[PDB]
């Protein structure tokens, strides 16, 4: 619809400090009498997209930077731009974590790693490895304790146990992040993952255990050991619990390998307050008393803003959240994060339920996460055959036969609906308004609503992807060829976030090759 212009709208996540946040609202509003409401809503990451694609949503979000990719492909975040002065107070590698395509989509504002937090009056000396929580937990069994108990809900919690000894999500190659080589399956995952199971199995931790669960255990000393990250510390220190935060647990002598969330704040692209919103990040949010008041309600972890991370840096808990952010890795900003999330997570809670076995569970993990590529192999090339004059090289043997056989089917379909279809696509196009990179993106956030409505089957996807094509060819006409591979790209995230589960189920292309067999 419309988002209300003359005040900011914020959403921030629950267990965050809006409270604090809010106060700094209120140093904003004293000096320009515009009103800052903070609101912290569920699945607020969920929901962003959904309503910021109809126009919707808050001015500006905040969430940490995995999910700003995909956000900034369909269109949803304004670009920041701040002078050099104003870039030099925030640490280079925090502005990296908000780079996507060479554009800034969000401020960074803290470091988020997950620590071992420990009772000291249960255990003043905790494990430097995995491999003797199961010896710890029989003892405090007999003690009526728990060793450990931390989100086993979250695949954020478990992956540092299943990178540690080789696991990685898309390898990491000087800054950039490739797809085409993902490792959910391989030995080190594996290897990981099975450990956990085990302490399931062994009845020295429950597959059932949330974050909820733990976190009252841990805060009524009902268990020696929990895993969570610094927003946490508050309500340890309003228990009766005497606490330490350390570097967590190696695995096979390698130390636990933490995906590193820099929370940043995006603003949203149909924002009305865009310049009120970089003025309350950039001079009100973004300095050393607003961070004190938004650490002061939850603490934010290692701050971004070096000025007051220097004084941070002293307490010895940041100090193990540094130790073991250094140890992990930041996660990538890209577009597939969403889809591999979801698929790790199910993963993950069918290997622990018995659901499915570990090999069973990251074999299909090592699918879900594959397929955004394959997509895009496919949609891309079929995007510019159909556009401009560059040589049909698949016929010819170019990739793969799935691909091969996927393209020469969609020529056959997809030819078939452009013919039939004409005058359709000439009125939904003409009802769009699509003469740049912006629009195209615009498309983005139009057809989820045209798509995702209703059943899926073969029949609107290929629609989807012929629509693609008589739009790429309208990009060439005007000459914007150089969007065709972005509008490919939009219709790859849009497609296989929305149908991730039934593309699966239906093995993916493969399947869709299957149905028509051309
Ligand atoms: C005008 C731009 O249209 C779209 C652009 C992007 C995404 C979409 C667009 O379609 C909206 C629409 O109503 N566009 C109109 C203008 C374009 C037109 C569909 C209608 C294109 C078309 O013929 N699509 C047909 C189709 C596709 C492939 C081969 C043969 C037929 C289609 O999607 N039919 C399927 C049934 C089906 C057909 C063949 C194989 C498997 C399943 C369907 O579900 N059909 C649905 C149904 O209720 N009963 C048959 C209707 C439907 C079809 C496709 C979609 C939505 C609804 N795709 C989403
Ligand atoms: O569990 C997958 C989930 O991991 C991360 O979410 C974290 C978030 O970064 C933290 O700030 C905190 O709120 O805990 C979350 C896990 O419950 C990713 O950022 C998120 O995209 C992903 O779904």
Redesign the pocket.
């Given at each position: 619809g419309k988002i209300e212009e003359g005040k900011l709208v914020i959403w921030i996540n629950g267990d965050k400090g809006y409270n604090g946040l809010a106060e700094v609202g209120k140093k904003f509003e004293k000096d320009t009498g515009i009103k800052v409401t903070v609101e912290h809503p569920d699945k607020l990451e969920e929901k962003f997209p959904q309503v910021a694609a109809t126009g919707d949503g808050p001015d500006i979000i905040f969430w940490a930077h995995d999910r700003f990719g995909g956000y900034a492909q369909s269109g949803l975040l304004a670009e920041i731009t701040p002078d050099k002065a104003f870039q030099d107070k925030l640490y280079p590698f925090t502005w990296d974590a908000v780079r996507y395509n060479g554009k800034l989509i969000a401020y960074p504002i803290a470091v988020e790693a997950l620590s071992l937090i420990y009772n000291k009056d249960l255990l003043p000396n905790p494990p430097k490895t995995w491999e003797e929580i199961p010896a710890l937990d029989k003892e405090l069994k007999a003690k009526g304790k728990s060793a450990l108990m931390f989100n086993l809900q979250e695949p954020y919690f478990t992956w540092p146990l299943i990178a540690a000894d080789g696991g990685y999500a898309f390898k990491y190659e000087n800054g950039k992040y490739d797809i085409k080589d993902v490792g959910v399956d391989n030995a080190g995952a594996k290897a990981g993952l099975t450990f956990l199971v085990d302490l399931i199995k062994n009845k020295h931790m429950n597959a059932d255990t949330d974050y909820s669960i733990a976190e009252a255990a841990f805060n009524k000393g009902e268990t020696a050991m929990t895993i969570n990250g610094p927003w946490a510390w508050s309500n340890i220190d309003t228990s009766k619990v005497n606490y330490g935060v350390t570097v967590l647990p190696t695995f096979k002598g390698q130390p636990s390998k933490p995906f590193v969330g820099v929370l940043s704040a995006g603003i949203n692209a149909a924002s009305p307050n865009k310049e009120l919103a970089k003025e309350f990040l950039e001079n009100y949010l973004l300095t050393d008393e607003g961070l004190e008041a938004v650490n002061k309600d939850k603490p934010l972890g290692a701050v971004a803003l070096k000025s007051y991370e220097e004084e941070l840096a002293k307490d010895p808990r940041i100090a193990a959240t540094m130790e073991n952010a250094q140890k992990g890795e930041i996660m990538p900003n890209i577009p597939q994060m969403s889809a591999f999330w979801y698929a790790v997570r199910t993963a993950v809670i069918n290997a622990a339920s018995g659901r499915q076995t570990v090999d069973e569970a990251l074999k299909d993990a090592q699918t879900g996460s594959e397929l955004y590529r394959q997509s895009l192999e496919i949609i891309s090339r079929y995007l510019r055959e159909q556009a401009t004059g560059a040589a049909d090289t698949a016929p010819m043997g170019a990739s793969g036969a799935t691909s091969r056989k996927a393209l020469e089917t969609l020529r056959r379909?997809g030819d078939?609906?452009q013919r039939?279809?004409e005058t359709?696509?000439q009125?939904?196009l003409r009802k769009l308004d699509i003469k740049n990179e912006d629009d195209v993106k615009s498309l983005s956030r139009v057809?989820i609503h045209?798509?995702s409505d209703?059943?899926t089957?073969?029949?609107?996807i290929?629609?989807?992807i012929?629509?693609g094509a008589f739009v790429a060819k309208h990009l060439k006409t005007i000459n914007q060829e150089s969007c065709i591979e972005p509008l490919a790209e939009s219709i790859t995230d849009v497609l296989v976030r929305t149908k991730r589960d039934w593309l699966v189920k239906q093995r993916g292309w493969d399947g869709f090759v299957e149905?028509?067999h051309v």
């Open positions: 379909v078939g609906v039939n279809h359709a696509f009125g939904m057809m045209v798509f209703g059943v089957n073969w029949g609107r290929v629609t989807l012929s629509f149905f028509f």
